[PDB]
Paper text:
MrgD, a member of the Mas-related G protein-coupled receptor (MRGPR) family, has high basal activity for Gi activation. It recognizes endogenous ligands, such as β-alanine, and is involved in pain and itch signaling. Mas-related-G protein-coupled receptor D (MrgD) is expressed in sensory dorsal root ganglia (DRG) neurons, the cardiovascular system, and the retina.
In the case of the apo state, no ligand was added during all the purification steps. We improved the density using local refinement covering only the TM domain on cryoSPARC. The overall structures in the apo and β-alanine-bound states are similar, but the ligand-binding pocket shows a marked difference. In the apo state, the side chain of W2416.55 faces the cytoplasmic side and is sandwiched between Y1063.33 and Y1093.36. This interaction stabilizes the close contact between TM3 and TM6 even in the absence of the ligand. We then focused on the two prominent hydrogen bonds between the side chain of Y1093.36 and the backbone carbonyl of S2346.48 and the other between the side chains of S2346.48 and S2687.45 in both the apo and β-alanine-bound states. Measurement of the basal activity of the mutants of these residues revealed that the Y109A, Y106F, and S234A mutations reduced the basal activity, suggesting that these two hydrogen bonds are involved in the basal activity of MrgD. We also performed MD simulations to investigate the stability of the apo and β-alanine-bound states without G proteins. In terms of the ligand-binding site, the conformation was more flexible, and the RMSD was much higher for the apo state than the β-alanine-bound state.
Author numbering: 22 to 285
Write the structure that this text describes.
Amino acid sequence: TVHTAYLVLSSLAMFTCLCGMAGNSMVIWLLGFRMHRNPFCIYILNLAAADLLFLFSMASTLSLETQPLVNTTDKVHELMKRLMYFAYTVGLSLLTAISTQRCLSVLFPIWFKCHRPRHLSAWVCGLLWTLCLLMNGLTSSFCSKFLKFNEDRCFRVDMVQAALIMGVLTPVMTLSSLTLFVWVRRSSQQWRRQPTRLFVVVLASVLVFLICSLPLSIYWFVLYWLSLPPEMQVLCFSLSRLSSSVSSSANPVIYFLVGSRRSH
Ligand SMILES: CCCCCCCCCCCCCCCC(=O)O
Ligand SMILES: CCCCCCCCCCCCCCCC(=O)O
Ligand SMILES: CCCCCCCCCCCCCCCC(=O)O
Ligand SMILES: CCCCCCCCCCCCCCCC(=O)O
Ligand SMILES: CCCCCCCCCCCCCCCC(=O)O
Ligand SMILES: CCCCCCCCCCCCCCCC(=O)O
Ligand SMILES: CCCCCCCCCCCCCCCC(=O)O
């Protein structure tokens, strides 16, 4: 029944949350202060931190939804839900940044080598964290039922957040990955041996992004603008949570173990 399909879909989410926390802790330990001559490692460290925050927040959320939410809980529950959302948004922004950096490394290699600011990843990540925190401090301040809660303002701030996420982070990331794919297939695979690994990893990252991370972003959009039945909305929420869980738990595998050159 519905309860069984919720319990099963939440147990998997908790298990993959624990696995993702372990993987991101390993990535932070193995890359926190080293491997930093690489221009690609600052984004990966920040993404690992963001994914660890996401998985910890939503693991706590899933743990404390078993308990009744009346007076003691349901106040930390909202805090950790906003933490989950903020970490999800910053992780999506960091994935877009990683894909754009990879595309620029091959579209403009001279700039990436001898003209890129050496701290550009650092303050790009700082700007992403600051902007995500600011946007989530508006979504929470206008839609949480423990703050200056409103009805006409929640819808506007959500139509800002979801529209920005989808119609900016999806086109930019997918277009950058497609351009990198096309450039490698045309100007690099034609002369020497075809880099099948590059095609495989780019396609896998794009597929994981679109099929796993984006469902949680579009669930907020389809909650409004459409009269979803209240019985099946919990199923959609569970699907979105598990998809984002899988994406965050697999990010260390497809961004660190694949990109492990100093660990050799
Ligand atoms: C409100 C949106 C503002 C714009 C956000 C754009 C996020 C993706 C692009 C910026 C991050 C990556 C920039 C290139 C990184 C690099 O190659 O050094
Ligand atoms: C406001 C949105 C865009 C933010 C862009 C932040 C900086 C991104 C990294 C540098 C992009 C340009 C790279 C060199 C391009 C070139 O000259 O060929
Ligand atoms: C919550 C706001 C702050 C979030 C973190 C800010 C960005 C931190 C970036 C990683 C650590 C600094 C890295 C600087 C560059 C380097 O050491 O090579
Ligand atoms: C990093 C992604 C998000 C980047 C942009 C963050 C801020 C988005 C907009 C916030 C809500 C603004 C709503 C309108 C406010 C007004 O008209 O006064
Ligand atoms: C403190 C940093 C994170 C939050 C930054 C964004 C601004 C938060 C507050 C937004 C609402 C401001 C107006 C409140 C009006 C009211 O009291 O109803
Ligand atoms: C991470 C910080 C985000 C911004 C928060 C700014 C403060 C928003 C207002 C909080 C008011 C709390 C007390 C009144 C609550 C209520 O009237 O419902
Ligand atoms: C990451 C952004 C977090 C923004 C702040 C979220 C706060 C959610 C509510 C927490 C409990 C607030 C309790 C005091 C106000 C009240 O009495 O309702």
